[PDB]
Design a protein around this nucleic acid. Structure first.
Ligand SMILES: [Ca+2]
Ligand SMILES: [Ca+2]
Lengths: 152, 152
DNA sequence: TCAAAACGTCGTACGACGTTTTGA
DNA sequence: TCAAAACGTCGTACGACGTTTTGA
């Protein structure tokens, strides 16, 4: 697990607070025991003209990748482990998304545990609800109550 | 003439490269000698529910103000002397808007002598064109060319 | 005649999701 | 049965201008 330069974090933090997204989702999927997958994502969105800036992030952070889908590109970090190492370090400097950051850190630690009891799995999903609530959520379909109905 | 915390500037630089805008305008106005005003605005935009963010800014930057605009809010800094002192210290940390920052405070220095000679005023107007070109301009109506004609 | 503010608009550039598939 | 990638859209929340008024 790599240590990041504090000044790089201070900057990246403000910028993430600005163009970034801390996202958790309950993606429906029949190949899982609980018919759902828990998915975490850290992303930074930028017009493709400036994608050189995201490529830089991949180099500075040393993990993740950029993806261009036309007018905009996203930096993407989904690997559970480096994501923990990264948010852990970055979280202290966030001012607008610090709560979502920690909610994710907590969710990640409970992940191995959550895949045992369908109860503890459902509790974690309510943590995801808390993240979606702190975000500017507009197009959310699957929530904890979905998981609850299906678990029966 | 306050001096700003480096930790504060680093974070803000990132936030500005994200939700910030360094703007330069030539505003058609028949009360000005050259019938145009050179206007400079540093601004940060945010959804009104996070209005407290901008509000806190005003306290920490020391000048400027916030205005509610229906569903989003803005921190505005227009006062020419503070704008210069502030941008002078925030320029070294910016990554996406450093050039336009340098041009802005280069204008603010030529302002006094730009009100005498149209050739010196029309030159400064092409600096304003450079900023518009660096930014993601989309609705720009008045340019140095427009000022060029009107000065005939 | 000017700095500065007041107020108004437009077209994305983002955020924040969604599905389906990969590949151990 | 999983973590992680591939690939997709929605609805703004931003950015970046505009016009007009204020008041020394
Ligand atoms: Ca933002
Ligand atoms: Ca941006």
């Amino acid at each position: 697990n790599t240590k990041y330069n504090k000044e790089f974090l201070l900057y990246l933090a403000g910028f993430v607070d600005g163009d970034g997204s801390i996202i958790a989702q309950i993606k429906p999927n029949q190949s899982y025991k609980f018919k759902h997958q828990l998915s975490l994502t850290f992303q930074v969105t930028q017009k493709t003209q400036r994608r050189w800036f995201l490529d830089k992030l991949v180099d500075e952070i040393g993990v993740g990748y950029v993806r261009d889908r036309g007018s905009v590109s996203n930096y993407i970090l989904s690997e559970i482990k480096p994501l923990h190492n990264f948010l852990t370090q970055l979280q202290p400097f966030l001012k607008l998304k610090q709560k979502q950051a920690n909610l994710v850190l907590k969710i990640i630690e409970q992940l191995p545990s959550a895949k045992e009891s369908p109860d503890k799995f459902l509790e974690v999903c309510t943590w995801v609800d808390q993240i979606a609530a702190l975000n500017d959520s507009k197009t959310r379909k699957t929530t904890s109550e979905t998981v609850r109905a299906v678990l029966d």
